[PDB]
């Protein structure tokens, strides 16, 4: 604590405990029952400790049903187009695996302008997976 000719300060009767104490000393039935109020882990893409085929499959499954479309492969990379058409790219990584979702443009920075749209469709795609499994 340090302050000179100042006259700015914290009103002592507003400190939680003190006011709590005074409320109790006044003896209000409700007061004795009232308690003070009390109170992430970001991860890259999506993790899954299951076979990379059953993962890759459910992704395509969930997709087709959401209206999305993908390119002809020949792999663990999906180059999709969703809908202007939004481009997106899915990658599988290595057991234990991670699925990466990356925004990739539009058709029919710009990335920045398409921050929510992207996150929205990726949200829908996750919930679709969830229900399936």
């Amino acid at each position: 604590y340090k302050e000179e000719d100042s006259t700015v300060s914290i009103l002592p009767t507003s400190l939680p405990q003190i006011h709590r104490a005074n409320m109790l000393a006044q003896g209000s039935p409700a007061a004795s029952k009232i308690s003070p109020l009390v109170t992430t882990r970001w991860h890259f893409g999506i993790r899954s400790r299951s076979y990379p085929l059953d993962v890759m499959g459910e992704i395509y499954i969930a997709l087709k049903n959401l209206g999305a479309e993908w390119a002809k492969p020949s792999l663990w990379t999906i180059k999709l187009r969703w809908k202007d058409l939004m481009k997106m790219v899915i990658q599988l990584f290595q057991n234990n695996y991670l699925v990466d979702f990356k925004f990739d443009g539009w058709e029919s920075e710009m990335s920045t302008f398409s921050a929510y749209p992207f996150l929205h469709l990726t949200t829908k795609l996750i919930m679709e997976l969830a229900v399936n499994s």
Partner: peptide, 25 residues
């Protein structure tokens, strides 16, 4: 249905408090 007085008891233990000063600050 409580009184302000009672309601204010939900305030967190970490509430800093109310600040005051005077016309001379």
């Amino acid at each position: 249905s409580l009184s302000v007085g009672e309601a204010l008891m939900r305030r967190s233990d970490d509430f800093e408090g109310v600040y005051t000063c005077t016309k001379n600050d």
